[PDB]
């Protein structure tokens, strides 16, 4: 992981945060919900 | 905040701030679950009781999106003392759970080990809050935000009265007139990772604000990922 995060988005094997889910790939995080912790919220 | 800038809609969406008895905001907190508000333990006693308010972006006008909610759960830690300003940290379960929405949703919290290695190592970070604009002037009535350098332990504890622990971090300026002030304690500091915003910090002390050859003090918050976890489950 001591090189760009092993190419993780999150969590580094990669991972999320709770509200997430790793997307097919293994690098990605996908939302569950549409306030999903530490985004910026969009009108 | 002295210097910076105003939130932008959605912009500071995991802020929080702490009301007293005749309705003023006094401290700061970060939405971390529907349930529970992370803040400083120093704002427990600042106030004789409180409220939490969650979606406020201006103090003196009503706009669509702002609740009260009332506090069920005080849990401070066990080891702060005002004689050393250590272990600054306390959750609060609210009675009632948050409705995430535009301007209201939560910080993440991230995992310790990685933290200290991909977080702690960035350049720079996040503060917010309400609170003065100058070291003796009034709180701002807009959420304001400012970017803060992460600065060097070392270098940092040349330059305090007060002992530096490890479970405190330093950031802000030496000179240039940008830094937290008084109202913004018990605030966020959050940190960007990609596109993701991970609570890193809990604004807690300084000598002034903005003082040249003084920085901005926070509760590290990797030092409190297990305890910060335990408390949430009651
Ligand atoms: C008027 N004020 C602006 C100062 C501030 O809030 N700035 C401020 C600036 C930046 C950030 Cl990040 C947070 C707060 C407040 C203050 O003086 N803070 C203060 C100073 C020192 C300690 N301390 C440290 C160790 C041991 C004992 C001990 O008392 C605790 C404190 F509360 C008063
Ligand atoms: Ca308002
Ligand atoms: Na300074």
Redesign the pocket.
Known sequence: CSLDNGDCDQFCVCSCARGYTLADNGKACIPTGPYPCGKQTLE | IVGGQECKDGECPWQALLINEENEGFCGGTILSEFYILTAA?CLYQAKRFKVRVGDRNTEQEEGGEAVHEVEVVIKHNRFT?????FDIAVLRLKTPITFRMNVAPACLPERDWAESTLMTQKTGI?SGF??TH??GRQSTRLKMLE?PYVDRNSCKLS????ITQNMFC??YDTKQE????G??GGP?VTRFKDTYFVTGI????????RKGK????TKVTAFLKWIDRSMKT
Do not use: M
Not at chain 2, 82 to 86: F, L, P, V
């Open positions: 120093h005002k004689e050393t300003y250590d503060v609170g003065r070291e003796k803060v305090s009265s007060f002992i950031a802000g830094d937290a002030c008084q913004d304690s500091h604004v807690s002390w300084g000598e002034g604000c903005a920085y901005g003090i926070y």
